[PDB]
Design a protein around this ligand. Structure first.
Ligand code: T44
Ligand code: T44
Ligand code: T44
Ligand code: T44
Length: 559
């Protein structure tokens, strides 16, 4: 029996959580309760197989069971076409209502009256809005959510204790989903082979002391864990993830020195810990990569006799000695190396041919460095808000076809690069910046993949996972774009508009700035400033009220 094997490893509590998460990811539209009913049934059934390893249907597969319950065009098929149906049906942007939070005491009451249904609510919601969220990590968030309500619903002030923490979680939560969506995307649109090269780079950076073999052993388990979590096998993923966390801690001494504090904590806490670890200290006297990848006369022989490994070795050896490079940059060099050999090992005298392959990297390394240097200066010079507006404008001209809600969303997140990385010294900027920009651009890609409207976005998105940032950065203003004509419906007054927080106002204002640019593509920074300002003064005056709607309607219709 499989269902029992898992229940035994994960425990009862977690098993219920993963099964719940597992259903909410497959059926994002069904109600909370319905799911609960499917979980409890599955939970009991397991308990029998735990007792009777030979009971009825215990020999089944997690996909058939989970599959059957969910069935009580996708179901009218069978394993595994049936499964690949649910996976292919996951919605990255469901039409689900805005998840707002009621009055502090309101929640606090419901948290006490029933603590279990409260959390399952949490997991349900978060899981349905993020059908790719890293299951194991979600358990980590759940426990931190629980801790918040148990310590804040019992103090002098609550909305001063809780809210501040609920903020930091939704934020860290959004980063987690993002980060993971890139992983699932990599595996899917490019295959695991692609995912392995990737994994070899970050790991060789965090664990410079580890031997190449050790790194491969982890990249293999790691590739298996994420394949499962991304494919929908959440139970096995958590089991595998925990086994690996154990492995890492046991061999801790042949991997990284930073794994100490991490390895002395509860399962959930050490997994998250290992996942966020900082780079270990790089070894001192390391031979020059040149010696073995350029000067040796057995390069081509090694490429031929074992390309996949030789390359692995190369990436690992370059990555470990360059913590200051972004993962994507390292893959670009890795690709350049493969192409230069592929060509050179056929030519007359190979050695001469690829003797200058390091020369071909220089260009690829400064392109990233300069951009990060420029937008960081700009960041200090303009502040987060004005900086995003600068991006808003820049990217709206590159891809005007894209929907406004999306351009605002992405651009803001692109803008967050400045404050999230610029405070770091040069050595830590690029890997913080460019790897982050890759996540954000992937959100653009997955959203855009639903209802495509720009072949430029589709090109930059599907042509190469590693070149995405450079590709987008290279785009020139789309001249084939056709000025969007004035609608006005976009500016229909709404009471709330006058009683908005600073964040809300900034969003409303950036939304307007995108519509402006879409309408007048040939506008200049100066005149955009003018139309913005005038209209800004307009909204501020009309809010001073009297009969607002009239003001905004009367004066508005005029504008
Ligand atoms: N910027 C990249 C770099 C990075 C990638 C991987 I792959 C990795 O290895 C793990 C190990 C475990 I255990 C996890 O639960 C996870 I998630 C990743 C680590 I450490 C760092 C990222 O963080 O995505
Ligand atoms: N006044 C500057 C021009 C400049 C404008 C922007 I807006 C900018 O910020 C980005 C961020 C990303 I991410 C991109 O892909 C791109 I293209 C530009 C940068 I850096 C430089 C100069 O002349 O130096
Ligand atoms: N129609 C929306 C409400 C809405 C009204 C306006 I008027 C508006 O336009 C601006 C322009 C600037 I410049 C501002 O600084 C601000 I605040 C609002 C926007 I965007 C949205 C709805 O029905 O939800
Ligand atoms: N008078 C023209 C129509 C027109 C109305 C407005 I109001 C306007 O100003 C803005 C300001 C912002 I901010 C926007 O996002 C947008 I879209 C338009 C402009 I320029 C033109 C006609 O009837 O031909």
């Amino acid at each position: 029996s499989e269902v029992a094997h898992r229940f035994k490893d994960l425990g009862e509590e977690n098993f219920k959580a993963l099964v719940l998460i597992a259903f909410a990811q497959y059926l994002q539209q069904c109600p909370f309760e319905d799911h609960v009913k499917l979980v409890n049934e599955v939970t009991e059934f397991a308990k029998t197989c735990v007792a009777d390893e030979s009971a009825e249907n215990c020999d089944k597969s997690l996909h058939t069971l989970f599959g059957d319950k969910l069935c009580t065009d996708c179901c009218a098929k069978q394993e595994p076409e049936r499964n690949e149906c649910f996976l292919q049906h996951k919605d990255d942007n469901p039409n689900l209502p805005r998840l707002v939070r009621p009055e502090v005491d309101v929640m606090c009451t419901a948290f006490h009256d029933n603590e279990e249904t409260f959390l399952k609510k949490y997991l349900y919601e978060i899981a349905r809005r993020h059908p790719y969220f890293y299951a194991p990590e979600l358990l980590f968030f759940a426990k931190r959510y629980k801790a918040a309500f148990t310590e804040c619903c019992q103090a002098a002030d609550k909305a001063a204790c809780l809210l501040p923490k609920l903020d930091e979680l939704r934020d860290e939560g959004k980063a987690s989903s993002a980060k993971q969506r890139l992983k699932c995307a990599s595996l899917q649109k490019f295959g695991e082979r692609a995912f392995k090269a990737w994994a070899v780079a970050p790991l060789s950076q965090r664990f410079p002391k580890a031997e190449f073999a050790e790194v491969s052993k982890l990249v293999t388990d790691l590739t298996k864990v994420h394949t499962e979590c991304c494919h929908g096998d959440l139970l096995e993923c958590a089991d595998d993830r925990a086994d690996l966390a154990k492995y890492i801690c046991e061999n801790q001494d042949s991997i990284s020195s930073k794994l100490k504090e991490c390895c002395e904590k509860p399962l959930l806490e050490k997994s998250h810990c290992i996942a966020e670890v900082e780079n270990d200290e790089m070894p001192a006297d390391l031979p020059s990569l040149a010696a073995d990848f350029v000067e040796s006369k057995d390069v081509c022989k090694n490429y031929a006799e074992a390309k996949d490994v030789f390359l692995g070795m190369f990436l690992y050896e370059y990555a470990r000695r360059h913590p200051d490079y972004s993962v994507v940059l390292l893959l670009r060099l890795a690709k350049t190396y493969e192409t230069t050999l592929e060509k050179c090992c056929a030519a007359a005298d190979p050695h001469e041919c690829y003797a200058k392959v390091f020369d071909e990297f220089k260009p690829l390394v400064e392109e990233p460095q300069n951009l990060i240097k420029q937008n960081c200066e700009l960041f200090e010079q303009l502040g987060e808000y004005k900086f995003q507006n600068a991006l808003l404008v820049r990217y709206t001209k590159k891809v005007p076809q894209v929907s406004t809600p999306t351009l605002v969303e992405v651009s803001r997140n692109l803008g967050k690069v400045g404050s999230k990385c610029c405070k770091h010294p040069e050595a830590k900027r690029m890997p913080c910046a460019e790897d982050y920009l890759s996540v954000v651009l992937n959100q653009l890609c997955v959203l855009h993949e639903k209802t495509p409207v720009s072949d430029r976005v589709t090109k930059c998105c599907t042509e190469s996972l590693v070149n995405r940032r450079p590709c987008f950065s290279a785009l020139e203003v789309d001249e084939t774009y056709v000025p969007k004509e004035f609608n006005a419906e976009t500016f229909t007054f709404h009471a709330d508009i006058c009683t908005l927080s600073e964040k809300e106002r900034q969003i409303k204002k950036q939304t307007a700035l995108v519509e402006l640019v879409k309408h007048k593509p040939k506008a200049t920074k100066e005149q955009l400033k003018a139309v913005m300002d005038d209209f800004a003064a307009f909204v501020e005056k009309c809010c001073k009220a009297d009969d607002k709607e009239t003001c905004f309607a009367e004066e508005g219709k005029k504008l």
